[PDB]
From a paper:
Over 40 different proteins, with diverse native structures or in many cases intrinsic disorder, form amyloid associated with human disease, yet all amyloid fibrils share a common cross-β architecture consisting of a continuous intermolecular β-sheet supported by networks of zipper and ladder-like interactions. Amyloid fibrils have a similar cross-β architecture, but fibrils formed by a single protein sequence can have diverse structures, varying with time, self-assembly conditions, and sequence modifications.
Cryo-EM was performed on fibrils assembled from 30 μM IAPP in the same buffer used for kinetic assays (160 mM ammonium acetate, pH 7.4, 1% v/v DMSO), in the absence (4 replicates) or presence (2 replicates each) of 50 μM YX-I-1, canagliflozin, or doxazosin. Fibrils were imaged after 2 weeks, at which point fibril formation was at a steady state, as judged by analyzing aliquots with ThT. Following helical reconstruction, multiple distinct IAPP fibril polymorphs were resolved, revealing further detail on the apparent morphological differences between the samples. Each protofilament is formed from a single stack of L-shaped IAPP subunits, with straight β-strand segments encompassing 13ANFLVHSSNNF23 and 25AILSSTNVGSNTY37-NH2, hinging on a turn at Gly24. Thus, out of the fibril structures that were identified in each data set, YX-I-1 fibrils consisted of 89% C-fold subunits, whereas this subunit fold was absent from fibrils grown in the control or with doxazosin.
Numbering used by the authors:
A (entry chain W), B (entry chain S), C (entry chain O), D (entry chain K), E (entry chain G), F (entry chain C), ...: 14 to 32
G (entry chain U), H (entry chain Q), I (entry chain M), J (entry chain I), K (entry chain E), L (entry chain A), ...: 13 to 37
Amino acid sequence: NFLVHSSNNFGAILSSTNV
Amino acid sequence: NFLVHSSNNFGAILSSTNV
Amino acid sequence: NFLVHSSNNFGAILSSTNV
Amino acid sequence: NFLVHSSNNFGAILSSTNV
Amino acid sequence: NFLVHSSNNFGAILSSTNV
Amino acid sequence: NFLVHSSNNFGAILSSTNV
Amino acid sequence: ANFLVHSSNNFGAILSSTNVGSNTY
Amino acid sequence: ANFLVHSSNNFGAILSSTNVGSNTY
Amino acid sequence: ANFLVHSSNNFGAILSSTNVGSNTY
Amino acid sequence: ANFLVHSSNNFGAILSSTNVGSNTY
Amino acid sequence: ANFLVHSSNNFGAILSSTNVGSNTY
Amino acid sequence: ANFLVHSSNNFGAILSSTNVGSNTY
Amino acid sequence: ANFLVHSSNNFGAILSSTNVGSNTY
Amino acid sequence: ANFLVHSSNNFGAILSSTNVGSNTY
Amino acid sequence: ANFLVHSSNNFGAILSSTNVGSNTY
Amino acid sequence: ANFLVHSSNNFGAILSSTNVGSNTY
Amino acid sequence: ANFLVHSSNNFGAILSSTNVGSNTY
Amino acid sequence: ANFLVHSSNNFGAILSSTNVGSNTY
Amino acid sequence: NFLVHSSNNFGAILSSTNV
Amino acid sequence: NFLVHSSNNFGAILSSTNV
Amino acid sequence: NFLVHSSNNFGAILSSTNV
Amino acid sequence: NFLVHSSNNFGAILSSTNV
Amino acid sequence: NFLVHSSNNFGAILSSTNV
Amino acid sequence: NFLVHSSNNFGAILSSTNV
């Protein structure tokens, strides 16, 4: 599973999966 | 499992998985 | 498992896995 | 398991695993 | 297990595992 | 097990394992 | 919870050229 | 919890050229 | 918990050229 | 817990060229 | 717990060239 | 616990060239 | 007699204020 | 007689204020 | 007689203030 | 007679203030 | 008679203040 | 008669203050 | 006598008499 | 006598008499 | 007599008499 | 007599008489 | 007599008489 | 008599008489 959970985000959130 | 949990993020959060 | 848990992050958090 | 736990981070946290 | 636990971090914390 | 525990870190903490 | 926040995020190339002067008196 | 925060994040190349002068009196 | 924070994060190349002068009097 | 923090983080190459002068009087 | 902190972190190459002068009087 | 801290951390190459002078009077 | 002349004469007070910037990205 | 002349004459007070910057990225 | 001349004459007070910078990244 | 001349004459007080910097990365 | 001349004459007080720096990385 | 001359004449008080530095990394 | 004679004047010519 | 004679003047010529 | 004679003046010529 | 004679003046010529 | 004779002046010529 | 004779002057020539 790939899950991103964010609360009160004022910044930058970068999530990446490369095969 | 790949999980990112963030609260009150004002900075930069970079998460990456490369194969 | 790959887990990143962040609270009150004002800095930079870099997490990477390379194969 | 690979786990990163951060609280009140104002600095730089770099975590990497390379094979 | 690979675990990083940080509280009130204003400096730089670098953790790496290379094979 | 590989564990890093830091509290009130203003300096530099470098931990590395190389095989 | 009270939040007063000024936030700026940038992700693109920025080029700026400024010239001030070349006045003859 | 009270937060007053000024936050700036940059991720792109930035080029700046400034010239001030070349005035003849 | 009261937080007053000024935070700056940079991740891109920055080039700056500044020239001030070349005035004839 | 009261926090007053000025934080700066840099991760990119920075080039700066400054010239001040070349004035004729 | 009261914290007043000025923190600077650098991780990139920095080149700085400064010239001041070359004035004729 | 009261903390007043000025902290500087550096990890990158730094080159600095400074020239001051070459003035004719 | 051939004359090609650019001539500028000034006799009055001159005030100049210039602001360039204050851009948020 | 051939004359090619650039001439500038000044006799008055001159005040110049220049601000370049204050950009947030 | 051939004359090529660049001439500058100044007789008044000159005040110049320049600020370049104050950029947050 | 061939004359190529660059001439500068100054007779007034000159004040110059320059600030370059104060950038946070 | 061939003359190539660069001439500078100064007769007034000159004050110059230069500040370069105060950058946080 | 061929003359190539660079001439500088000064007759007034000159004050110069230069500061370069105060950078935190 | 007060006499000002000018030919091909591109500059500034200031003549004054004050008693 | 007060006489000012100028030819091909590109500069500044200031003549003054004060009593 | 007060006489000023100028030819091809590109500079500054200041003549003054004060009593 | 007060006489000023100038030819091809690119510099500064200051002549003054004060009593 | 007070006489100033100048030719091809690129410098500064200061002549003064004070009583 | 007070006489100043200058030719091809690139320097500074200061002549003064004070009583």
